[PDB]
Amino acid sequence: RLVKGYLEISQDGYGFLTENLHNLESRVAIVSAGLIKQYALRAGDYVVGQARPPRENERYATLLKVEAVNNLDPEAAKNRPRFDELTPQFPDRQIRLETTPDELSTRVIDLLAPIGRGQRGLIVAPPKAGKTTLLKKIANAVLKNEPDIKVIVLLIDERPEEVTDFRESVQGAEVIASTFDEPPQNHIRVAEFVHERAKRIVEEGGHVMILLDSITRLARANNLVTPPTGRTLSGGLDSAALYFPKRFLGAARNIRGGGSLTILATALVETGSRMDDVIFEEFKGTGNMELHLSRRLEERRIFPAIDILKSGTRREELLLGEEVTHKMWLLRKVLADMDPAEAMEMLLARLARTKNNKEFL
Amino acid sequence: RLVKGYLEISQDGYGFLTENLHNLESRVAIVSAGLIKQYALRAGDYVVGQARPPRENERYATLLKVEAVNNLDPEAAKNRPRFDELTPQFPDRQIRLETTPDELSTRVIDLLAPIGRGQRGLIVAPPKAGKTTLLKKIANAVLKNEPDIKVIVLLIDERPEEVTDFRESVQGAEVIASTFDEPPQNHIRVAEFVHERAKRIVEEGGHVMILLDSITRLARANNLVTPPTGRTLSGGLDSAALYFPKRFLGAARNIRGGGSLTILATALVETGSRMDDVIFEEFKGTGNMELHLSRRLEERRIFPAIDILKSGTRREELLLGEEVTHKMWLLRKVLADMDPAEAMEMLLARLARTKNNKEFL
Ligand SMILES: Nc1ncnc2c1ncn2[C@@H]1O[C@H](COP(=O)(O)OP(=O)(O)O)[C@@H](O)[C@H]1O
Ligand SMILES: Nc1ncnc2c1ncn2[C@@H]1O[C@H](COP(=O)(O)OP(=O)(O)O)[C@@H](O)[C@H]1O
Ligand code: BEF
Ligand SMILES: [Mg+2]
Ligand SMILES: [Mg+2]
Numbered sequence A, B: 001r002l003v004k005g006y007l008e009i010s011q012d013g014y015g016f017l018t019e020n021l022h023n024l025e026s027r028v029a030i031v032s033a034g035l036i037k038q039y040a041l042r043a044g045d046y047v048v049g050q051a052r053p054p055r056e057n058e059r060y061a062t063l064l065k066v067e068a069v070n071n072l073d074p075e076a077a078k079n080r081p082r083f084d085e086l087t088p089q090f091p092d093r094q095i096r097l098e099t100t101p102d103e104l105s106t107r108v109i110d111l112l113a114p115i116g117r118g119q120r121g122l123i124v125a126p127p128k129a130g131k132t133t134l135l136k137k138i139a140n141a142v143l144k145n146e147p148d149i150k151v152i153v154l155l156i157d158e159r160p161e162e163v164t165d166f167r168e169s170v171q172g173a174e175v176i177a178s179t180f181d182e183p184p185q186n187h188i189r190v191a192e193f194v195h196e197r198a199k200r201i202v203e204e205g206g207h208v209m210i211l212l213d214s215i216t217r218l219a220r221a222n223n224l225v226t227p228p229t230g231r232t233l234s235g236g237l238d239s240a241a242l243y244f245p246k247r248f249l250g251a252a253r254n255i256r257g258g259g260s261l262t263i264l265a266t267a268l269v270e271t272g273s274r275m276d277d278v279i280f281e282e283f284k285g286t287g288n289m290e291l292h293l294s295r296r297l298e299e300r301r302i303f304p305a306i307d308i309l310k311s312g313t314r315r316e317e318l319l320l321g322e323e324v325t326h327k328m329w330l331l332r333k334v335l336a337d338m339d340p341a342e343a344m345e346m347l348l349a350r351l352a353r354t355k356n357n358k359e360f361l
Helices: A033-039 A103-112 A131-145 A160-169 A184-203 A215-225 A243-250 A274-284 A295-299 A322-336 A340-353 A356-360 B033-039 B100-112 B131-145 B160-169 B184-203 B215-225 B243-250 B274-284 B295-299 B322-336 B340-353 B356-360
Strands: A002-009 A015-017 A029-031 A046-052 A062-069 A120-125 A150-156 A174-178 A207-213 A253-255 A260-268 A289-293 A306-313 B002-009 B015-018 B029-031 B046-052 B120-125 B150-158 B175-179 B207-213 B253-255 B260-268 B289-293 B306-313
Touching: A002 A029, A002 A184, A029 A046, A029 A062, A033 A062, A046 A184, A103 A131, A103 A306, A103 A340, A103 A356, A120 A131, A120 A274, A131 A150, A131 A160, A131 A207, A131 A260, A131 A289, A150 A160, A150 A184, A150 A215, A160 A174, A160 B253, A174 A184, A184 A207, A184 A215, A184 A243, A184 A260, A207 A215, A215 A243, A215 A260, A215 A274, A243 A260, A243 A274, A260 A274, A289 A295, A295 A340, A306 A322, A306 A340, A340 A356, B002 B029, B002 B184, B029 B046, B046 B184, B100 B131, B100 B306, B100 B340, B100 B356, B120 B131, B120 B274, B131 B150, B131 B160, B131 B207, B131 B260, B150 B160, B150 B184, B150 B215, B160 B175, B175 B184, B184 B207, B184 B215, B184 B243, B184 B260, B207 B215, B215 B243, B215 B260, B215 B274, B243 B274, B260 B274, B289 B295, B295 B340, B306 B322, B306 B340, B322 B340, B340 B356
Parallel strands: A120 A260, A120 A289, A150 A174, A150 A207, A207 A260, B120 B260, B120 B289, B150 B175, B150 B207, B207 B260
Antiparallel strands: A002 A015, A002 A046, A015 A029, A046 A062, A253 A260, A289 A306, B002 B015, B002 B046, B015 B029, B253 B260, B289 B306
16 A cells, blocks of 8 residues: 655654645554654655555554655665755756746746746735736746746635636646635645745755745734744734744755755735835845836736836846846836836837847847 | 524534524524534524423423424535535626616626625725615615525624614515624624524525625724734734634635625725724735725715726626626726716716616617
8 A cells, every 4th residue: 555745743753744735634644753764754755655554543554664755765865965054056047937828927027037946036016916817927937938847836825716726727736725714823834844845855956946925924924823022023023923934935045966946925015014014125135036016007907017127136147148138238227217007018019029039139 | 383593503512593683592492412413503504493392490492303404404414515615716607786776886886896606895985985875785786686695784883773774675685783882792793693604505505695884893893802912913903803804704705516605895994094994905805896985976976986996806707708898998998097086977977878788889
């Protein structure tokens, strides 16, 4: 009998193998501390192994033998550089964007913010600005441009029917979701489990995409979970709550020894709460990529409703050639001085004629 | 002897059958934990059954036998998917509106926010902006367009005489009311009971329609009831009180297995308190419909006093055909630029000539 799951090591030295729901389930498989020490297994490690029905007085199946860890033969787990000791460097492998149903979005993103491997990016938009739809387009583009990259879609505290829509429209990539009906406890648990899985995969030199809608809601759950920390930060935030979201996002990095962790998350702003603004400014100092969306552009029904002037990445030269670098610099200079909605309107009109490369030509 | 009511399960595993007043009554019928276990009854379930006079030393009549649960035989109770387990989808069945005493209002709403089954909608207006009268029009229009839909009206913390007006104007559709004379505890209890009833009916695939005036007042009661939660959001809002209103509203959804829960509620804004505005922005992120009414349009006595540009839904394509989609897109493009009051004036003048479908022609 074969069982599979993702390792979750408890406090007692033994662990369980989880399902896609990322929660304790009746079918989880027991993993003894002996096996964990035997294979240097770590939280989030994907374990596949033959198991047996539980004996009498046993409520969960026990993993008799470990077969594959993170899809590989487990000796390599013993002698590998730990994810935490991997050298972080800047995103050195740009990732072109193109999605057929709306490739305006992909070309505009590419012209506004290049994506590499190890990207620590954020999209900052008010509610109802295509934020979620842009995330969908990016997911589709990645699953066409980088099929090799494990694309993980994490949805925290968001709308269930949107969860269904992405699950259906992601063409099978790992969609982990926890709707707003769930308490922040569920959100934090699922997010951390997915995060650990991603770090374990990257520890195997893997390139991982995490499309995290509502990182702000994740921070909200973190604050709701932070037990006191004492004083209150301006806006209602807690001083020690944002440490966990900060670490969570900062995990995204490029590795010199193989693999990359790229987390692209969606940020809410212009929400009337100092809390949201403080979270945004706190995360911007950690991220390498920002794309700002304008509420007014959406109000005019101009899509993608991007605020071009505020958008950009850091170290684009590492993701773009000199010709492309000068092209983008020219484009920003031309558009820098002038109004947002008009900017998107003529950018769309000019890019609509042809693909971006010819739009240059 | 027969009795009927709605099931309210106590902490001790037994329950009582309630009347329309949605509270403890002397006439409530005891329900043993047994019957609940056999019939798998749940809170809000409507139970009808032959009862007996209570024995000596008994204060409440006891349900000797269960005959029907939610108007259907008890067997289906044992084998049915739980409401929490129902797959949510987008509102896929538009509900077209009309009320004879004001077809202007209903047709403008249809042109501004088409309604589907499972709609999580909201109308946002300052005090004295027709929100109550508009809700009255919607109640009347639904009781003419969708008699099949169980029309439940919930009036929380609102003017009593308006309650009574709705009583003789709702034409018998279930209305559960709790004026501002009641404490917030009564509001919370009654709202939760009605909510559970609605979920239980939809669990039987029923299309349930909930018109909730004073949802902001419901949130006020939630905040007043929340025992501490420690910190406070800007404007005086509690950090954890709003979870319950959020879950309450998010219950509204479209079920892919049949039935729907469509909740439309009245929101108060421009009230001079950060609290109402924070509530509005927070529920806007959960609702799939917003219809904005302008105080100035009321002050000019122009009705309905709708702010067209701010009003709109999400996924209209699922509720309207392509011709209607293009028509409304054209109408907004034309109306996008015009002043609120004057835009409404021109709209009313044009639509007054004919039924909306001929106004298209
Ligand atoms: N590129 C687009 N094309 C068509 N509609 C869009 C586009 N972007 C946004 N919208 C509309 O805006 C609404 C909100 O977009 P969404 O991204 O889901 O919200 P948010 O930006 O707050 O996550 C959607 O219902 C959608 O119809
Ligand atoms: N369509 C309308 N036609 C005539 N009078 C209206 C209309 N809408 C609102 N009003 C007037 O505005 C006042 C406030 O309306 P209502 O929505 O019932 O109260 P509130 O908006 O303060 O809850 C009422 O006294 C009513 O006479
Ligand atoms: F309305 Be957005 F999705 F926050
Ligand atoms: Mg969204
Ligand atoms: Mg009112």
